Design a protein around this ligand. Structure first.
Ligand code: LP9
Ligand code: MN
Ligand code: MN
Length: 131
């Protein structure tokens, strides 16, 4: 019930997402930074990096118009969303799936972590602080 655009969507806002989890305390943050100065950071308790990365995307999907460009450094989350499942065993993923269906156009790009990608580093620096 959804598909990913092969190209960045002209006119749409670019959401740089990221997550961070502390392995001992299970504490993590998830959020985004956009090319338009929009930001969000949420707190999460009892969690993993994977989950925080998915949560960041959920945030980006929730706080965006009918058209989005999303760039993530999560191969894990890219995997799930590119697989285009109809239903998952994960509550968080099911929430993401239905968000994507609500959208006119969705573009999801992958970028490597800590390689100087401005938007990625910006959002990393925010979610990493205190973890
Ligand atoms: C600020 C420093 O952060 C980093 O250097 C950093 C990562 O080490 C990192 C690792 C990732 O992939 C993995 C995530 C978790 C695991 N594990 C669970 C299966 C084991 C820990 C393995 C690979 C995915 N994203 C990451 N991001 O965004 C980072 O900023
Ligand atoms: Mn990451
Ligand atoms: Mn990071």
């Amino acid at each position: 019930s959804y598909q990913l655009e092969k190209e960045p969507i002209v006119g749409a806002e670019t959401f740089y997402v990221d997550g961070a989890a502390n392995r001992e305390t299970k504490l993590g943050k998830a959020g985004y930074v956009t090319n338009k100065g929009r930001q969000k950071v949420v707190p999460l308790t009892n969690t993993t990096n994977q989950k925080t990365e998915l949560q960041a995307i959920y945030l980006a999907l929730q706080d965006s118009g009918l058209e989005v460009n999303i760039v993530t450094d999560s191969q894990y989350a890219l995997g799930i969303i590119q697989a285009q499942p109809d239903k998952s065993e994960s509550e968080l993923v099911n929430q993401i799936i239905e968000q994507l269906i609500k959208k006119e156009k969705v573009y999801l790009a992958w970028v490597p972590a800590h390689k100087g990608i401005g938007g990625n580093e910006q959002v990393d620096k925010l979610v990493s602080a205190g973890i």
